[PDB]
């Protein structure tokens, strides 16, 4: 059929939750049997989030094909079944980098390359590439309407609406309707000025999503409906909610999907939100609760562990366990000591880069292993576990990673190019994306995944030194998973411990609220068993 497009923009302020709204609406349309997809347009000059620090942009989400993207794609995969790829997230820097490469190559035939139409042509080509092949395509424009940085994005999508037509395009505008105490009522004036910004660039909104700390009354929605020349049913109230999994139900309660299916002339059955109602049911009726400590180095911005924090909540839904996540600075463990790690039913060390705070994570891993506290290490959290076991069990003095101490005697973690031993003898590139992993029989993860092979996503450089691995294995450490040709260690386990698993890949990128994740489900389940054993 004909591909339909829903352009999503926001005004007044920036942190309106544009991606959450687009993902929630896409879950409704998908629930009606429609083939839906989402993409994100960022107005940054960075070519991709690969260079951005975690404390600035958030987590670096990794798709299946190995693309480093904005974390909004994690929201997309946690709401709809469609798998994101590189074509679902591009930036202004990517556009200019592509146009500049075509010009120097001479593909513009000596013409003068301009913002209009050449930059806008490059944007339309990418929006079409990621969209064509689906029924409805949701395009989220980053930034606030009225700023310089998103003007090429808005002018580009305006040309698509003209060329495609109003029977297959919709402009959905999020706006802020703030409440004033001195007025006792929410205020529509910021929406008035924001919609006037869209008109001055040739965009007429079709749907207004009103964001506020409370429901926007029907009287105030009527003023917005008349000022914007849209039907009253096209003005939706989106109040602040405690759980984002309720937002799909809120939009359907106001007929947002019925208005979109009508405008696009799509004949599809009513949405069946039973799976989202079940997710809300499990979250609202827990049996017990636990406290899991997440010891990392980017705690100053909790969004640096977005998918990890969300996957922990998913492990609680499947076990009916309420999870209280306690962010603990690993550098505080370096100075104040282990005393800060008391009162935890489980310990998780997420990934990261840089030596700052690593020794605090190595001390944290030793504390969880010796005191039989359920432990889950991811990427860097696996390295600090291998370093702890090699030092304090295998008696490898000052064993470390070449990333932190290049001239160490026992480089248990190093690049494949650097593999050596304690004598210096040798043998005779960022890994990104999904890769198959072979699980070892009689291992804990072989039972959790209930499969001989699995597929997880990577983002790391330094690997386990296979030259020093067999000595650590003789000390009791277990290898639970290998991958590829070089038999690189992917998962390690410590027997004689209630639950101690560490993996090289990032399992949080495959966890969803409706399906959970086998690793996090067993990790949270072991946390409640540890808590109950403290009668």
Ligand X SMILES: Nc1ccn([C@@H]2O[C@H](COP(=O)(O)OP(=O)(O)OP(=O)(O)O)[C@@H](O)[C@H]2O)c(=O)n1
Binding region for CTP: 14, 147-149, 187-192, 223
Q: Quick one: tokens of 521?
A: 């489900």
How many residues touch a copy of itself (CB under 8 A)? 62
Residue 96: which residues within 8 A CB-CB, separation 6 or more?
A: 45, 119
Q: Quick one: tokens of 471?
A: 């000595």
Cα end-to-end span (Å), the chain = 62
Alpha-carbon Rg for the chain in angstroms: 26
Rounded to a whole number of angstroms, the minimum distance from the CB of residue 183 to ligand X is: 7
Query: Cβ(80)–Cβ(513) under 8 Å?
Result: no
Residue 47 binding: pick among ligand X, a copy of itself, none (C-beta 5-8 Å cut-off by kind): a copy of itself
Q: Quick one: tokens of 432?
A: 């990104």
Q: Is 147 in the site for ligand X (CB under 6 A)?
A: yes
Of 229 and 453, CB closest to a copy of itself: 229
Report how far residue 446's alpha carbon sits from residue 213's, in angstroms, rounded to the nearest whole number.
Answer: 46
Residue 104 binding: pick among a copy of itself, ligand X, none (C-beta 5-8 Å cut-off by kind): a copy of itself
Q: Which residues contribute to the annotated binding site for Mg(2+)?
A: 72, 140
Report how far residue 79's alpha carbon sits from residue 456's, in angstroms, rounded to the nearest whole number.
Answer: 19
Q: Is 78 in the site for a copy of itself (CB under 8 A)?
A: no
Judged by DSSP in three states, 95 sits in helix
> Which of 55, 100, 115, 455 forms a contact with ligand X (CB under 6 A)?
115
379 is catalytic: yes
Query: Cβ(257)–Cβ(28) under 8 Å?
Result: yes
68 is catalytic: no
Residue 300 binding: pick among a copy of itself, ligand X, none (C-beta 5-8 Å cut-off by kind): none
CA 103 → CA 70, 96, 121, distances in Å?
Answer: 28, 10, 14
> Which of 1, 2, 33, 53 forms a contact with a copy of itself (CB under 8 A)?
53
Binding mask 5-44 for a copy of itself (x = CB under 8 A): -------xxxx-x-------------------------xx
Binding mask 196-235 for a copy of itself (x = CB under 8 A): xx-xxxx----------x---------------x------
β-strand 346-349 against 400-401: which pairing, if any? Answer: unpaired
* Phi/psi at 318 (5° precision): -75, -20
Residue ranges in 6-45 that form contacts with ligand X under rule CB under 6 A = 13-14
Q: Quick one: tokens of 512?
A: 């969803």
Which one of 210, 228, 261, 379 is the catalytic residue? 379
Residue 147 CB neighbours (<10 A): 12
Residue 426 binding: pick among a copy of itself, ligand X, none (C-beta 5-8 Å cut-off by kind): none
User: Which of the 8 DSSP states describes residue 275?
Assistant: H
Q: Is 116 in the site for ligand X (CB under 6 A)?
A: yes
Of 227 and 530, CB closest to ligand X: 227
397 is catalytic: no
> Which of 146, 249, 255, 433 forms a contact with a copy of itself (CB under 8 A)?
146
Report how far residue 248's alpha carbon sits from residue 244's, in angstroms, rounded to the nearest whole number.
Answer: 8
Q: Quick one: tokens of 455?
A: 């597929």
> Which of 69, 144, 175, 331 forms a contact with a copy of itself (CB under 8 A)?
144
> Which of 65, 66, 86, 149 forms a contact with a copy of itself (CB under 8 A)?
149
| Closest among 338, 309, 308, 318 to 526, alpha carbons compared | 318
In what helix (H) or strand (E) does residue 343 lie, and over which residues does it extend? none
Of 165 and 495, CB closest to a copy of itself: 165
Judged by DSSP in three states, 415 sits in coil
Residue 223 binding: pick among ligand X, a copy of itself, none (C-beta 5-8 Å cut-off by kind): ligand X
Report how far residue 358's alpha carbon sits from residue 269's, in angstroms, rounded to the nearest whole number.
Answer: 54
Residue 103 binding: pick among ligand X, a copy of itself, none (C-beta 5-8 Å cut-off by kind): a copy of itself
Q: Is 324 in the site for a copy of itself (CB under 8 A)?
A: no
* Phi/psi at 112 (5° precision): -90, 115
**Conformational region of residue 46, where left means phi above 0, alpha means psi within -120 to 50, and beta covers everything else:** beta
Rounded to a whole number of angstroms, the minimum distance from the CB of residue 160 to a copy of itself is: 12
Of 161 and 294, CB closest to a copy of itself: 161
Q: Is 148 in the site for ligand X (CB under 6 A)?
A: yes
Angle at 365 between CA 300 and CA 68, to 5 degrees: 50
Q: Which residues contribute to the annotated binding site?
A: 14-20, 72, 140, 147-149, 187-192, 223, 239-241, 352, 380-383, 403, 461
3-state SS of 504-519?
CCEHHHHCECCCECHH
Catalytic residues: 379, 506, 508
For ligand X, the binding residues (CB under 6 A) are 13-14, 114-116, 144, 147-149, 187-189, 223
For a copy of itself, the binding residues (CB under 8 A) are 12-15, 17, 43-47, 51-53, 56-57, 93, 96-97, 99-100, 103-104, 106, 108-116, 118-119, 144, 146, 148-149, 151-152, 155, 162, 176, 178, 180-183, 187, 189-190, 193-194, 196-197, 199-202, 213, 229, 240
């Amino acid at each position: 059929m004909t591909t339909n497009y829903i352009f999503v923009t926001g005004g007044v302020v920036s942190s309106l939750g544009k991606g959450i709204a687009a993902a929630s609406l896409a879950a409704i349309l998908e629930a009606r049997g429609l083939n839906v997809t989402i993409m994100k347009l960022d107005p940054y000059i960075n070519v991709d989030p690969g260079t951005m620090s975690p404390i600035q942009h958030g987590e670096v989400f990794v798709t299946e094909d190995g693309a480093e993207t904005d974390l909004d794609l994690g929201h997309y995969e946690r709401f709809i079944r469609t798998k994101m790829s590189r074509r679902n997230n591009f930036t202004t820097g990517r556009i200019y980098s592509d146009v500049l490469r075509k010009e120097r190559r001479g593909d513009y035939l000596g013409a003068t390359v301009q913002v209009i139409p050449h930059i806008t042509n490059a944007i339309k080509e990418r929006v079409l590439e990621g969209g064509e092949g689906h029924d409805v395509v949701l395009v989220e424009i980053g930034g606030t309407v009225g700023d310089i940085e998103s003007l090429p994005f808005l002018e580009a999508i305006r040309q698509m609406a003209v060329e495609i037509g109003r029977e297959h395009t919709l402009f959905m505008h999020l706006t802020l309707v703030p409440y004033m105490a001195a007025s006792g009522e929410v205020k529509t004036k910021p929406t008035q000025h924001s919609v006037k910004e869209l008109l001055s660039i040739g965009i007429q909104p079709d749907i207004l999503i009103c964001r506020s700390d409370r429901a926007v009354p029907a009287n105030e929605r009527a003023k917005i409906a008349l000022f914007c020349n849209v039907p009253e049913k096209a003005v939706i109230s989106l109040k602040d909610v405690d759980s984002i999994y309720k937002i799909p139900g809120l939009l359907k309660s106001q007929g947002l999907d019925d208005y979109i299916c009508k405008r696009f002339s799509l004949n599809c059955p009513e949405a069946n939100l039973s799976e989202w109602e079940q997710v809300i049911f499990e979250e609202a009726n827990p049996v017990s609760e636990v406290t899991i400590g997440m010891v990392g180095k980017y705690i100053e911005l909790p969004d640096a562990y977005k998918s990890v924090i969300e996957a922990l909540k998913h492990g609680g839904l499947k076990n009916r366990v309420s999870v209280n996540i306690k962010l603990i600075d690993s550098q505080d463990v370096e100075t104040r000591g282990v005393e800060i790690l008391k009162g935890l039913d489980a310990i998780l060390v997420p990934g990261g880069f840089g030596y700052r705070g690593v020794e605090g994570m190595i001390t944290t891993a030793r504390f969880a292993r010796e005191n039989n506290i359920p432990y889950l290490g991811i990427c860097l959290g696996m390295q600090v576990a291998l370093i702890d076991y090699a030092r304090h069990v295998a008696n490898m003095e000052n064993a470390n990673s070449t990333e932190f101490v290049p001239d160490c005697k026992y480089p248990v973690v190093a690049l494949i190019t650097e593999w050596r031993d304690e004598n210096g003898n040798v043998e005779v590139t960022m890994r990104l994306g999904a890769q198959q992993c072979q699980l070892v029989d009689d291992s804990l993860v072989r039972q959790l995944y209930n499969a001989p092979t699995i597929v997880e996503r990577h983002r790391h450089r330094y690997e386990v030194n296979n030259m020093l691995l067999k000595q650590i294995e003789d000390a009791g450490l277990r290898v639970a998973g290998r991958s590829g040709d070089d038999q690189l260690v992917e998962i390690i386990e410590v027997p004689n411990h209630p639950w101690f698993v560490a993996c090289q890949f990032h399992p949080e990128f495959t966890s969803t609220p409706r399906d959970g994740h086998p690793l996090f489900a067993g990790f949270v389940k072991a946390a409640s068993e540890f808590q109950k054993r403290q009668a």
